[PDB]
Amino acid sequence: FSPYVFNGGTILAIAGEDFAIVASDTRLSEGFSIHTRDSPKCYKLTDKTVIGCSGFHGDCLTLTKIIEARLKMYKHSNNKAMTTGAIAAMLSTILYSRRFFPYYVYNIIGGLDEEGKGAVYSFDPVGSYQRDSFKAGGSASAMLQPLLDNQVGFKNMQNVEHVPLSLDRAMRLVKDVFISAAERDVYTGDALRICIVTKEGIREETVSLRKD
Amino acid sequence: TTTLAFKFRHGVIVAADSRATAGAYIASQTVKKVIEINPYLLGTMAGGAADCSFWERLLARQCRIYELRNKERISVAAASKLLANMVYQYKGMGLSMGTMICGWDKRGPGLYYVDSEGNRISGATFSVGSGSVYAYGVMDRGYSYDLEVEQAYDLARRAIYQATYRDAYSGGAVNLYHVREDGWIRVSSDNVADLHEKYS
Amino acid sequence: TTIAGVVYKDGIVLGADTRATEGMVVADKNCSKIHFISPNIYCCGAGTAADTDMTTQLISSNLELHSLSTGRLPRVVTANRMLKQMLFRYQGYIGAALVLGGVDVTGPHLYSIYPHGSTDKLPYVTMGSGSLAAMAVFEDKFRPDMEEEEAKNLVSEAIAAGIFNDLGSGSNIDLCVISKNKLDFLRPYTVPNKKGTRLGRYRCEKGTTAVLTEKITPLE
Amino acid sequence: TQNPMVTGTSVLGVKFEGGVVIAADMLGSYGSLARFRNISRIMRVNNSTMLGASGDYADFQYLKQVLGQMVIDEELLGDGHSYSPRAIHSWLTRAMYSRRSKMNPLWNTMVIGGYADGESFLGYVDMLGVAYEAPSLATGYGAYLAQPLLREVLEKQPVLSQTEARDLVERCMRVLYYRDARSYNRFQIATVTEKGVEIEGPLSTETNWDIA
Amino acid sequence: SIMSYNGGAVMAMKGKNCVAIAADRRFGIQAQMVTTDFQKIFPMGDRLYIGLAGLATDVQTVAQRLKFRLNLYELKEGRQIKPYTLMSMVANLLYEKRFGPYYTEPVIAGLDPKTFKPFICSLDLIGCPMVTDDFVVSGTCAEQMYGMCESLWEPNMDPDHLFETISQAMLNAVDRDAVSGMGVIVHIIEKDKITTRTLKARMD
Amino acid sequence: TTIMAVQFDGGVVLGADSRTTTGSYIANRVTDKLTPIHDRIFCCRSGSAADTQAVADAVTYQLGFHSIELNEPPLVHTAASLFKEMCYRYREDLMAGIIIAGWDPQEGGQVYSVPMGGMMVRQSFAIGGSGSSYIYGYVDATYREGMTKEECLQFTANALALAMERDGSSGGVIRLAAIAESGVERQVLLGDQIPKFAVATL
Amino acid sequence: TTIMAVQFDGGVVLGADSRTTTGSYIANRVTDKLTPIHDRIFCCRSGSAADTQAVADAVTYQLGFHSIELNEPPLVHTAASLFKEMCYRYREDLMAGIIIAGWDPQEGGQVYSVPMGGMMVRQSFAIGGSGSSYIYGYVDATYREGMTKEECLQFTANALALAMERDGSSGGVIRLAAIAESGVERQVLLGDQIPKFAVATL
Amino acid sequence: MEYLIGIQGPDYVLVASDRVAASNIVQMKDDHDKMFKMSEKILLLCVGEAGDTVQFAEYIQKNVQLYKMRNGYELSPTAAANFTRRNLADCLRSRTPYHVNLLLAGYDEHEGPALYYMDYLAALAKAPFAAHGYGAFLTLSILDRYYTPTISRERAVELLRKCLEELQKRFILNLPTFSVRIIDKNGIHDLDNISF
Amino acid sequence: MEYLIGIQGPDYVLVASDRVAASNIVQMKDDHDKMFKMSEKILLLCVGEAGDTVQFAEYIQKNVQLYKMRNGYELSPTAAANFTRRNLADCLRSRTPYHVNLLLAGYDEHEGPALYYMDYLAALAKAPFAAHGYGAFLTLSILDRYYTPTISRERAVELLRKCLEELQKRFILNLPTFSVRIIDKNGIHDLDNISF
Ligand SMILES: CC(C)C[C@@H](C=O)NC(=O)[C@H](CC(C)C)NC(=O)[C@H](CC(C)C)NC(=O)OCc1ccccc1
Numbered sequence A: 001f002s003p004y005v006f007n008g009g010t011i012l013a014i015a016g017e018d019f020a021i022v023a024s025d026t027r028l029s030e031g032f033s034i035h036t037r038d039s040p041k042c043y044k045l046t047d048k049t050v051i052g053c054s055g056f057h058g059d060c061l062t063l064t065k066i067i068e069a070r071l072k073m074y075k076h077s078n079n080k081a082m083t084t085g086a087i088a089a090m091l092s093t094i095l096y097s098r099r100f101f102p103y104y105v106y107n108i109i110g111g112l113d114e115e116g117k118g119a120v121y122s123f124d125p126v127g128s129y130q131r132d133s134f135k136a137g138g139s140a141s142a143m144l145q146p147l148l149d150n151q152v153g154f155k156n157m158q159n160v161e162h163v164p165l166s167l168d169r170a171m172r173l174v175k176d177v178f179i180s181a182a183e184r185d186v187y188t189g190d191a192l193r194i195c196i197v198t199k200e201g202i203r204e205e206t207v208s209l210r211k212d
Numbered sequence B: 001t002t003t004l005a006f007k008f009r010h011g012v013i014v015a016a017d018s019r020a021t022a023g024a025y026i027a028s029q030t031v032k033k034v035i036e037i038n039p040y041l042l043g044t045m046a047g048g049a050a051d052c053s054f055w056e057r058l059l060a061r062q063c064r065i066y067e068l069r070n071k072e073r074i075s076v077a078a079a080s081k082l083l084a085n086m087v088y089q090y091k092g093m094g095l096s097m098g099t100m101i102c103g104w105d106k107r108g109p110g111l112y113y114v115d116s117e118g119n120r121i122s123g124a125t126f127s128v129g130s131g132s133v134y135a136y137g138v139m140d141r142g143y144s145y146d147l148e149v150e151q152a153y154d155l156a157r158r159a160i161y162q163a164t165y166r167d168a169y170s171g172g173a174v175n176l177y178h179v180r181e182d183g184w185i186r187v188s189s190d191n192v193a194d195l196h197e198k199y200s
Numbered sequence C: 001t002t003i004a005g006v007v008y009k010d011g012i013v014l015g016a017d018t019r020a021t022e023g024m025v026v027a028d029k030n031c032s033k034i035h036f037i038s039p040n041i042y043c044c045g046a047g048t049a050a051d052t053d054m055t056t057q058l059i060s061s062n063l064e065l066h067s068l069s070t071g072r073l074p075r076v077v078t079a080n081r082m083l084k085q086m087l088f089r090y091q092g093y094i095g096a097a098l099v100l101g102g103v104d105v106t107g108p109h110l111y112s113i114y115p116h117g118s119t120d121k122l123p124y125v126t127m128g129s130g131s132l133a134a135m136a137v138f139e140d141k142f143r144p145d146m147e148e149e150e151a152k153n154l155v156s157e158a159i160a161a162g163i164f165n166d167l168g169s170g171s172n173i174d175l176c177v178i179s180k181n182k183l184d185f186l187r188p189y190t191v192p193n194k195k196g197t198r199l200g201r202y203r204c205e206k207g208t209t210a211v212l213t214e215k216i217t218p219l220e
Numbered sequence D: 001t002q003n004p005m006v007t008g009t010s011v012l013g014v015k016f017e018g019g020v021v022i023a024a025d026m027l028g029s030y031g032s033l034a035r036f037r038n039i040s041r042i043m044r045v046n047n048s049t050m051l052g053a054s055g056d057y058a059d060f061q062y063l064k065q066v067l068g069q070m071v072i073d074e075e076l077l078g079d080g081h082s083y084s085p086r087a088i089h090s091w092l093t094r095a096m097y098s099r100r101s102k103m104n105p106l107w108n109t110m111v112i113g114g115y116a117d118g119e120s121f122l123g124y125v126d127m128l129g130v131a132y133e134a135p136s137l138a139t140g141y142g143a144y145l146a147q148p149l150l151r152e153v154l155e156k157q158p159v160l161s162q163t164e165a166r167d168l169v170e171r172c173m174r175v176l177y178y179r180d181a182r183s184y185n186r187f188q189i190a191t192v193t194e195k196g197v198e199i200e201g202p203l204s205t206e207t208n209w210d211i212a
Numbered sequence E: 001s002i003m004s005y006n007g008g009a010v011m012a013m014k015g016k017n018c019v020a021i022a023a024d025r026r027f028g029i030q031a032q033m034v035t036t037d038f039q040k041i042f043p044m045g046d047r048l049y050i051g052l053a054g055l056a057t058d059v060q061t062v063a064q065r066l067k068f069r070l071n072l073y074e075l076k077e078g079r080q081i082k083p084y085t086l087m088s089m090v091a092n093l094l095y096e097k098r099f100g101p102y103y104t105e106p107v108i109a110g111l112d113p114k115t116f117k118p119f120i121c122s123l124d125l126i127g128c129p130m131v132t133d134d135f136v137v138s139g140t141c142a143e144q145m146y147g148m149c150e151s152l153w154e155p156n157m158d159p160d161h162l163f164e165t166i167s168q169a170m171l172n173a174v175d176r177d178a179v180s181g182m183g184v185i186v187h188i189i190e191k192d193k194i195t196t197r198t199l200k201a202r203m204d
Numbered sequence F, G: 001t002t003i004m005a006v007q008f009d010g011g012v013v014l015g016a017d018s019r020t021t022t023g024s025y026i027a028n029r030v031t032d033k034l035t036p037i038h039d040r041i042f043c044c045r046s047g048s049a050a051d052t053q054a055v056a057d058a059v060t061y062q063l064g065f066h067s068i069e070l071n072e073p074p075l076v077h078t079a080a081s082l083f084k085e086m087c088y089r090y091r092e093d094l095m096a097g098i099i100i101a102g103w104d105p106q107e108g109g110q111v112y113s114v115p116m117g118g119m120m121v122r123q124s125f126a127i128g129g130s131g132s133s134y135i136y137g138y139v140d141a142t143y144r145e146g147m148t149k150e151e152c153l154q155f156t157a158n159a160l161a162l163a164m165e166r167d168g169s170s171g172g173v174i175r176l177a178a179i180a181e182s183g184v185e186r187q188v189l190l191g192d193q194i195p196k197f198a199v200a201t202l
Numbered sequence H, I: 001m002e003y004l005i006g007i008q009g010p011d012y013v014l015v016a017s018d019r020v021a022a023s024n025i026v027q028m029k030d031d032h033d034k035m036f037k038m039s040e041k042i043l044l045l046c047v048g049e050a051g052d053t054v055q056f057a058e059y060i061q062k063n064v065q066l067y068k069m070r071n072g073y074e075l076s077p078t079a080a081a082n083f084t085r086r087n088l089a090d091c092l093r094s095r096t097p098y099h100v101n102l103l104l105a106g107y108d109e110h111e112g113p114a115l116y117y118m119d120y121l122a123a124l125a126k127a128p129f130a131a132h133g134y135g136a137f138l139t140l141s142i143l144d145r146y147y148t149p150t151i152s153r154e155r156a157v158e159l160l161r162k163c164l165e166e167l168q169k170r171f172i173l174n175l176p177t178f179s180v181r182i183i184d185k186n187g188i189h190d191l192d193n194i195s196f
């Protein structure tokens, strides 16, 4: 008996000056088969925070329910909603509690900081987390990170002006990167769920990818 | 990972790289591997990122409870013993954690190497990580207790740079801290790419 | 891989997907899985690409030497016997699952060959990781003695089932129709899936990449 | 079950307009041998929920007892509150994930079908806590043989009638008999509607053509 | 883990009447670099080249054994090899070792010896050829290289734009691979010239 | 797989299911496991498809050359012996259970079971395959000496049906063959033609 | 081992072989695998001797205390439920295939199969053991609804005899018990009393 | 393990090798020589499994010496490095593989000094400086920090000393003496052993 | 491995330990002390798996120092050896075994000098001289050839230097410095370190 199964899934998160974009594909798979062509991997935790989860869907469903309970429990004892950084810190402890039987999940939290700026925190299966400006996770993490490092980071490029990232360029980059991943990753490619966090709230958009 | 620490005439110099890897995939090149337990005590992280980060944060919370209860900051020796005793309880279970606890106590500048395999040793110069061997050669040929502060800073940066060059798992920026009686300071975070141009 | 084959009233319709994958990453988005064995015989191949593109190539050479000596069109039974008697002496070490189909002097003949040497002459056959999706379409819609357009729509529907339901299958649909009077190889028969349009321009202009050294060798 | 014993084959479910229909063969195989050929692998939970299970039949019989008692218990309260299809599906996911985490899994893949509040529920629960909802579901070899045919129809015509849904199931049950070696011709069909859950008798796919 | 022992990355891209072939330059054992100037791309004709990634012994052996056959073919047939024939030849050598293969996957970039038409290709470790009309990648950063070339490659790129694309794709992909890099070399093959450039790359 | 052969005064009746399986998948649902090695000698193949097809092809070749050289119809024992020779010689590289039954002008209708391992034994009736186990008590209880081709054809059809209903690796159609001096008559039982037995209700 | 239980209007007929074996050695050649759990509820045991005996003792202990408190003859479904509950809670520690058959004033004669794993099914006729594999076809061709107690006795005898002739772990004598409201009637068939089927000798 | 080091200079190639032969926990020899004279201007420093080093090294030496006798001239450092690589690579997939890590060093009157690093898998790389052994991990960085392409033969011996002093301080194995030789236009020259 | 040697004389016990803390091919410390003071007349030299050595040794040290505090007198070298052997044998079949090889050296006014040997299996052996490590295989024979029950403390340091110089010539590991301490009626005396 093997307690884990890779169910596929790609998650991306880009932080801006007033917006944070968490995005994911909507494909659940087991082996060379497709369970559902409509399973988004993004979850709204607060009006200012969304988490993306990929790996073993059994552990993903459990962790999100554990996180939602812990968020309500923090509000009951502290009389205030949890910050994106507080959720990032708690997740690291919730993940390391299962160090000897880890949750096979890759988590990227996107939200606004207490100053209203975007905040992306990337997490490893057993805890390790870090604030980043952009992060891809899941099946096509290695196919999406390189272009984001070049376009959003402006790396390996000379004589190029480092303009601040607009939401529109961020939106177009997210869509373009997922279309390239869909053409080369077999686990990514049903639809794209883009969730955008701003002062107004978490707007959600869905685009179509390629059905195998 | 290449972490370095040496005790000289003007205190203790602590240096590290910034690369984190998931296999042969560079997950990050901006990881902070030096933990500020107190304004005067710092820990370095080499091995499992989650393991090292979790137990140094547990040591920081334990060292604060010590200051509140005993109205005095823990010694570098007492902090290293807590970490060693904590990790010993899970010996053989697979924790990978190589660390260096550096600071200024009432006995003066202190540097301790605590591993997840039960090792706790004091010393003047330690280097932990996959680039430790590469860094030891340079720091040893340039180490001197009577080294000047700027010479000590340059030695730490060169030793980390020469290891980021020979070790595939080490790279990013050399982050340098200087622990002194007034407390540690963050001297610099130079990228190895700009140091390749300087050292050539 | 989704390779399928059906025997209709006038001949045989073979079909295949066009995706090759190394691990869980796509390597070729337009591979040819239908191979020429003889002017009257074609073979769809699934499994190790190098094995299916060498067992077929060697049998095509041997049936050519046979047809030059005999002076007669090759018989699909000769290809099956040659292919099976080779796959057997390798005990499944050469992983070549194939759908051999052709029309000879005795009519149209469709066969399934497995990497160990087993063959099966059947009216409809499917192979590859998309075989059961394709078989569900054939066990639900196959009717004996159909027409070309009806039989071609069936093999495209079977290939689509594997392309949209299998993860090792995808890209375009190729169909090879063989009659006693015509061999139609429709390589890009149906292009069911396409890459989305780029929304942002990421072109790097001259000067973006810094070079350390350059050497231009003039060619005559 | 660390090692499954007498087990059932595939269970199919498709949501039509006004309810859901599930189908299962009435056979329990003991490793190739068709030992028990008149066992129901479908269960009526409440008046709005029905459960079909694949895998160990003893593990399913245990669940029929626990879920059966849970429904009797809530009815004794007489408070006008009843477990809904999504609540039973939520409970089964937590039940399987807990057992998998104890390394003692219930070897069962279940399809929950339900109709409540003019809304059709069709959920999937595996033995690892992997759960999802879909317009059509198929367990075991039904995933590689029947789901393709079901999904093709549910794409051109997203909403099917009860007659169109029953016809699709009978065609998928026929294909499963032809290419599944653990399948039996005698099978049951269960439909949940506003009129409650009904389980059809020992139906046969005598629509088996054999042009050998 | 027999291909990540020595690391490596090679990429070939098509342009308008021009081809490009780039390679990393690091030679290392597991995590130790030994040299930063190892050759992985070898000339197989005036406008024909082959980039080899995998075990470094296999890169050198396959190149040398390919030159043996190529020089014999060129002298006997009295003509330069056309890009497609070299691919068929490499496939024959690699498959002759099907049960006990060379741990190297080759990319061929060249212009037809007469029509000067761009040809690029990739073969597996047992010799399975795949001709593409866009780009071909091979190495330990292949996934990173796929994502970069799928989002940056454009049709009918000129010689200068082909250099800026193959170079940017190689530099950002090897920067996410720990066992690949220590320099990048790029050969732009055109009808009248072969420009070779070394790029400023992270040496970490 | 269920293969069965019975001898009658004048010939032999042979029978088989029609199911090929890769795991629990039915690769072929209409397979012919009754192969003709010569004009009046057939084989019932069980076990590995590739191994059984290769050995049957080899024996047909060797038996064909022997018959043209020795200008005389082949003996059923000779075919069984050539099958035994290969199946014993490659017993460690071949999974093949075979029943060689046919009619010869000298010894009449003969049924020979060359099981796995390479052993060869003449039998009044022979059964083989994964479904053979479920019908051992039936064949032992229903077999009677002096049966006819018609009674023997019913015995084979009834026995194969019971095995095909209990063995998952057996099923499809029942292919029957009757070999006698007159010739070889082949018959396929499908659907309601396949013998049926009532299930219980409790 | 071969164990069989058959229902009839008024009661059930249980039967078993008598061979306990360790490898290919027969430790007990006259074992009784038919154990009275209560006055009109017996269990046919198959699998591990120690596990079967331990479970039958525990269920007899529990059923007896239950019947004393309730002050009523116990139900065969209650006996089958207790066996299933213990054989499912300890499925990984016990190798116990059991068939519970008996009579009760409510549902009359009832046969329940509790195979290894812990599932329980009410059946018209149940067969268990390593010899059941050979009698599946025979029991599916000769079972007829409406059989009398005498016919059910003859049916069980012929079935157990056929499996004892083809299974190495089965043999000895055939022990049969017919339970009804009148009571239990146990008998042993030895030697010639055991049904005989002519072996086909060429 | 055993230690091999090579530093290529503008007109010379300096090589050093440890002089210890160990059984298990005991050094059975402290005057061992791991350098073989292939030609008058080519040296092969070989380390590896017992029996495999001399069997492969003596084989390459007798074949390079046969070339000089058969052709009247000697093989160049590059030809010798390639001949060695082909033989080590052609016995890798054979049933008799040689576990040997080598450092060929030679001086061609035309191409000048050359140092070639080869691993047991038979990967040949030309290097300005290279080392073989676990001690290479503690010394390659000292060479990278101080090696300059125009290093003098005097400064080359000083850097060799810096690297061997590092082995005495940080290495866990007692490597006390080192055989030091240099190659140039005038041939191979034995230098004093750096002992500690 | 680490080296421990103890030589007992007519009225004293001389002990020595290597001063190196290694970590995979590297010496991370050259001034390590493997000797723990239990009383003013008993020394415990512990070597073995990391953590187990300091964890077990500090436990015995604290329990011995607790006995002096509660009883006003100190435990004998023999009672300390027996107490240690019990604490290692009880943890032997436990889930937390300690892998520690130890030499206990102590002096009692009545029983005089005493040297005890204990292995990870927890066997206690009193011996005139003893050693732990792979270097014991090369030094116990020199101790057997030159040891006399009436050896002076000056001739004893000479026998110790003969054993340590044998490690400097035949052992494969670099053990350059050795701590030396003597116990007598006047307590433990730290003699100069024997370095090479
Ligand atoms: C602890 C510091 C040195 C930080 C960091 C820098 O090297 N550590 C590391 O990179 C090493 C990688 C390797 C040496 C095992 N340890 C690590 O844990 C990192 C974790 C993320 C940073 C990717 N790499 C890794 O493989 O973790 C993935 C993982 C996931 C689940 C369980 C265990 C391990």
Ligand SMILES: CC(C)C[C@@H](C=O)NC(=O)[C@H](CC(C)C)NC(=O)[C@H](CC(C)C)NC(=O)OCc1ccccc1
Pocket: C001, C019, C020, C021, C022, C023, C027, C028, C031, C032, C033, C045, C046, C047, C048, C049, C050, C052, C053, C168, E124, E125, E126, E128, E129, E130
């Ligand atoms: C004509 C078809 C056989 C081509 C296609 C269809 O199956 N091949 C495939 O899909 C298979 C996937 C595998 C699951 C069989 N992929 C491949 O065969 C690819 C070839 C592409 C990179 C061009 N090569 C490959 O992975 O071979 C590695 C290998 C090496 C030695 C033995 C076995 C396998």
Ligand SMILES: CC(C)C[C@@H](C=O)NC(=O)[C@H](CC(C)C)NC(=O)[C@H](CC(C)C)NC(=O)OCc1ccccc1
Pocket: C092, C114, C115, C116, C118, C119, F001, F019, F020, F021, F022, F023, F027, F031, F032, F033, F045, F046, F047, F048, F049, F050, F052, F129, F169
């Ligand atoms: C002898 C024939 C009449 C076949 C007959 C057996 O009795 N029926 C069967 O079902 C046997 C079952 C056997 C494994 C016991 N089937 C088989 O032997 C199958 C048949 C292949 C054509 C798929 N062979 C097999 O499993 O290995 C060959 C193979 C090679 C590649 C992929 C899948 C299968």
Ligand SMILES: CC(C)C[C@@H](C=O)NC(=O)[C@H](CC(C)C)NC(=O)[C@H](CC(C)C)NC(=O)OCc1ccccc1
Pocket: G001, G019, G020, G021, G022, G023, G027, G028, G031, G033, G045, G046, G047, G048, G049, G050, G052, G095, G169
């Ligand atoms: C007694 C019935 C439950 C059925 C009985 C008859 O086969 N079962 C058995 O005999 C099984 C068969 C199998 C588990 C090896 N054998 C057994 O349970 C053991 C074998 C030991 C290694 C545990 N046989 C044995 O030791 O004999 C004990 C015995 C002897 C006589 C009467 C009752 C019990």
